RNA sequence: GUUUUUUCACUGACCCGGUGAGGCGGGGGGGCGAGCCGGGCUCUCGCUUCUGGCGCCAAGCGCCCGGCCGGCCGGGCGCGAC
RNA sequence: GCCCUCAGCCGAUCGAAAGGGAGUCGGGUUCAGAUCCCCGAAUCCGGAGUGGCGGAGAUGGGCGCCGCGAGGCGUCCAGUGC
């Protein structure tokens, strides 16, 4: 069946012998500027001293409750663009022949009506830009008495209104069909968001290597381990 | 798909055609090296009449921008009458003179009277 | 605790050299060797000096995918750099 | 038009009418011009869409079936020159 004419020929690469090949050189690349600079944006935030009040938008809500949690909201959300087209013009077809319950967009709405004495439960975003607009407002939830959880996502909160993105979503409404399931994630977020709120405070970010000195202390740790053991036993 | 080549090269972007909202000019501007403006007045010297008897050729003067390509159709289409070559220079006083040879099935006398230079 | 200060240490500002920013740090996998009775512990290595030659744009091996009437003809994803 | 690969540059642009840099030479002619005019001999780069004609690649070897022989018939492998 086969052919004797061919032949085999491998190459070896080893070293002052054949042309090296092409290959995987990710790590080596010179990359422009403007990714140099937001890949070490990053670094900065593990070495140093995270401090304890902008530590805590690291501390985000899980995966079953993430998923869960916009499906109520899916029920009471703002309507379409194409809607106000049929309820504007639904008042002049019965004329010429108590809102439901719906979000809160912003946080200069959101700041106000949970001092107020309004609102049940309180939303906020992770990744908010200029940090300093969302500084504050944890601290506020805690004393009043308004629950507050952060997700993952500030693109797909203001994706639930129709926008690019948001920070804060607040409920101070929801109906008679909904009053189980809204009395229930209240009390999933609370225990471990406004009773360990204390635990919060202390716990500072940051003072933490990147590797390339992790494996260096820790290698000359067991050699105050081999000079303890073989002295002794 | 994977890494090769230790640079970053910006990549190659799609460029659309221009498609203008109003053409800038109303109309195209003219054209004012005619036939007409670019062949002067014969010139008509003791030594450019030495240059039709006996070359068989004649003597113009000429719009200065004037290519010899040029010249060489505004000879052909307002005499009828076709060229063998086009000399040109420059005067001291500053016009353009090009020596224009004939065909020898054409004649040299003979059309220099219909014009008017004898 | 809060500081008053002496040393030896760290890297994240910030400085300098090198290059087409081409293989640096951690573990695994095999060869040569050190010692305890097929078993692990502590490592030394990872293939190229005889000549005033030659070396690139993968052979070899798996696993699928469409064309003509078991054979004829043309592409995809891997091994080599674990 | 789009996609797959394939491409080291290396710095825009200016700087020499005595550096580098393909190819024109004879006989005649005008008051004043000629290696530029005219008679005659030559030839450098571009161009060819129907690439306009010759030549070169290319013309061969071995068997069968008729023929006194030169050749004629099919049937099967060579020929990028010597």
């Given at each position: 069946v086969?052919?004797?004419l061919?032949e ?15 290959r ?5 690349v010179?990359?422009?500027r403007?990714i140099?600079?937001?890949r ?5 935030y593990?070495?140093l001293?995270?401090?304890?009040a902008?530590?805590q938008?690291?501390q985000?809500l ?19 663009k194409?809607?106000?087209?049929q309820?504007?013009l639904?008042?002049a077809?019965?004329?010429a022949?108590?809102r ?6 912003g946080?200069?709405?959101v700041?106000?009506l949970v001092?107020?004495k309004?609102?049940?439960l ?5 990744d908010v830009?200029?940090?300093?607009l969302?500084?504050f407002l944890?601290?506020?939830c ?5 629950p507050?959880c952060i997700?993952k ?15 804060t ?10 009053k189980?399931?809204?009395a229930?994630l209240?009390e999933?977020?609370?225990?471990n968001?406004?009773?360990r709120?204390?635990e919060?405070?202390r716990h ?5 290597l990147?590797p390339?000195?992790v ?11 081999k000079?303890?053991a073989?002295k002794?036993? | 798909?994977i ?20 053409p800038?000019?109303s109309?195209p501007?003219?054209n004012?090296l005619?036939?007409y403006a670019?062949?002067?007045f014969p010139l008509?010297?003791?030594?450019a ?8 050729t004649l003597v ?5 921008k ?6 060489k159709?505004a000879?052909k289409?307002?005499y009828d009458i ?5 000399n ?7 016009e ?7 065909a020898p099935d054409?004649?040299?006398?003979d059309?220099?009277?219909?014009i008017?230079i004898?």
């Amino acid at each position: 069946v086969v052919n004797p004419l061919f032949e085999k020929r491998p190459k070896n690469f080893g070293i002052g012998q054949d042309i090296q090949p092409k290959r995987d050189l990710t790590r080596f690349v010179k990359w422009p500027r403007y990714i140099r600079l937001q890949r070490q944006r990053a670094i900065l935030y593990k070495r140093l001293k995270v401090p304890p009040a902008i530590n805590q938008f690291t501390q985000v809500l899980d995966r079953q409750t993430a998923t869960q949690l916009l499906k109520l909201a899916h029920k009471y959300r703002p309507e379409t663009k194409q809607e106000k087209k049929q309820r504007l013009l639904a008042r002049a077809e019965k004329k010429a022949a108590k809102r439901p319950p719906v979000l809160r967009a912003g946080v200069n709405t959101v700041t106000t009506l949970v001092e107020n004495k309004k609102a049940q439960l309180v939303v906020i975003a992770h990744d908010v830009d200029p940090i300093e607009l969302v500084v504050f407002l944890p601290a506020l939830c805690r004393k009043m008495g308004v629950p507050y959880c952060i997700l993952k996502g500030k693109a797909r909160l203001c994706r639930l209104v129709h926008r690019k993105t948001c920070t804060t979503v607040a409920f101070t409404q929801v109906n008679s069909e909904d009053k189980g399931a809204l009395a229930k994630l209240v009390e999933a977020i609370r225990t471990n968001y406004n009773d360990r709120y204390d635990e919060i405070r202390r716990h500072w970010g940051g003072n933490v290597l990147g590797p390339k000195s992790v494996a260096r202390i820790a290698k000359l740790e067991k050699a105050k381990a081999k000079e303890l053991a073989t002295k002794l036993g | 798909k994977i890494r090769t080549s230790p640079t970053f090269r910006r990549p190659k972007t799609l460029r659309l055609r221009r498609q203008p909202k109003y053409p800038r000019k109303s109309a195209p501007r003219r054209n004012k090296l005619d036939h007409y403006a670019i062949i002067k007045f014969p010139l008509t010297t003791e030594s450019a009449m030495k240059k039709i008897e006996d070359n068989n050729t004649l003597v113009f003067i000429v719009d200065v921008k004037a290519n010899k390509h040029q010249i060489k159709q505004a000879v052909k289409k307002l005499y009828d009458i076709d060229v063998a070559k086009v000399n040109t220079l420059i005067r001291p006083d500053g016009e353009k003179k090009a020596y224009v040879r004939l065909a020898p099935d054409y004649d040299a006398l003979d059309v220099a009277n219909k014009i008017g230079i004898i």
